[PDB]
């Protein structure tokens, strides 16, 4: 299976450029998935969807 966890971060975390984001999805049992990315140096208006990790 593949499934997408959707999070709206607009007011909660302030993801401007050059910003490190760290985290995990932790299940009831078993090993966590590790989220780890640094947002790009430049965001361009021609490319509103970005691949982060």
């Amino acid at each position: 299976d593949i499934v997408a966890i959707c999070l709206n971060v607009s007011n909660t975390l302030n993801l401007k450029p050059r910003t490190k984001v760290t985290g995990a999805v932790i299940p009831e049992f078993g090993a966590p998935a590790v989220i780890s990315f640094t947002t790009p140096a430049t965001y361009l208006d021609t490319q509103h969807i970005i691949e982060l990790q």
């Binding site: 140096a41 430049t42 361009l44 208006d45 021609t46």
Partner: protein, 106 residues
């Protein structure tokens, strides 16, 4: 590199620059320029006040104006001794904006 002259000196320089092939976008607001004449070594950094975008559509360099709020005034004459200004000469995709001059291929 081009250079206006008066008196006994070259007084303004305009250094035209572009990305290398296959480069990721470069954000000039965080660049640094270093120049020396063998007697002094200045280092200069971007002051957002001195941007002219319009020239992407043609005009005269070395006579570009800039916009302090409420007025238009000549760029080169006003630019401080420790700062560099930027003038967009070709940009297809409006990637350069006054607060974030990011240059991309072309």
């Amino acid at each position: 590199v081009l250079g206006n002259h008066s008196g006994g000196k070259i007084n303004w320089l305009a250094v035209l620059i572009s990305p290398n092939a296959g480069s990721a976008p470069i954000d000039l607001s965080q660049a640094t320029v270093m120049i020396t004449d063998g007697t002094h070594k200045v280092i200069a950094k971007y002051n957002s006040t001195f941007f002219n975008g319009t020239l992407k559509n043609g005009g005269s360099i070395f006579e570009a104006k800039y916009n302090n709020t409420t007025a238009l005034k000549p760029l080169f004459d006003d630019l401080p001794a420790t700062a560099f200004g930027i003038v967009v000469l070709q940009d297809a995709d409006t990637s350069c904006s006054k607060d974030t001059p990011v240059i991309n291929k072309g």
